[PDB]
């Protein structure tokens, strides 16, 4: 990557964002995870006085070209803004000479969240398993004040950190800045549309706003009401907008109670200016919440 050819003018704005050699250390040889957007690392961070911070160093193989760059540095000024308990914080990121981009994440020692619910071992109470939807509600009301649209929200995309305090976060596809651009990558990537957390109005019209991340907010609350189980599993992405189009929705799960499908009812409504804001999930929720004994 020639670092010498970007805008003068971003390079300026994106240092603070920028890390390296001077307080991070990749470990390259203990991955975290893999994914079709690179590999996840385990890293240290160190500060002025040699406190080590533990991190997850995401590679964005994919990033190679100016364009590309020049987006990459944009999303991590935009990103390094984000300050709030339910989601995930940018530590940095690292623009190298030699090898892709990194992005430093705060290491989360529960992992995500879809796959702590599915797990025989774990027991999540159905008031922790609301609990956890109630901290996305909170992440997701947040970023939905910063004008920032997720697009791929879903369970696996937040984790759970050493308290099990839920972060929003993205583990997929280096983020861009355009819808247009969003299917272009993932038509020349052969990465996955999130078809079955997508709102109707997104699959007709392929653009996202935050009245689609309450769409898919809602089928997140349907995962934590299952314990992670794949939504619409029996319908083929390409039929998903004919069964919408029908009125059909995701049935209620046996332990989802009354007052919560409700609002999952109203997330997947067909108009979307009818859909209720983040601040109003947050308060519905925190009533049904309310109501948990545990
Ligand atoms: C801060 C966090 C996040 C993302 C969304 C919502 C809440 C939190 N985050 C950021 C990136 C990221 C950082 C910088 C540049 C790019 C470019 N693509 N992604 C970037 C990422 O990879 N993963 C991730 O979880």
Sequence with gaps: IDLSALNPELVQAVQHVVIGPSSLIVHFNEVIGRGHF???????????????????????????????????????????????????????????????????????????????????????????LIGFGLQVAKGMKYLASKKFVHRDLAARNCMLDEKFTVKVADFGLARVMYDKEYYSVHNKTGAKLPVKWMALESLQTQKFTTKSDVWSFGVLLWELMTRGAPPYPDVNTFDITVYLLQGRRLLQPEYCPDPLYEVMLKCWHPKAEMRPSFSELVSRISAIFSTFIG
């Design 38 to 128: 690179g590999c996840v690392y385990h890293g240290t961070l160190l500060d002025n006085d040699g406190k080590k911070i533990h991190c997850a160093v995401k590679s964005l193989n994919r990033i190679t070209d100016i364009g590309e760059v020049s987006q990459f540095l944009t999303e991590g000024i935009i990103m390094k803004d984000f300050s709030h308990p339910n989601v995930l914080s940018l530590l940095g990121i690292c623009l190298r000479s030699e090898g892709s981009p990194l992005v430093v994440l705060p290491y989360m020692k529960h992992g995500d969240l879809r796959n702590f619910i599915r797990n025989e071992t774990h027991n999540p109470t159905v008031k922790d």
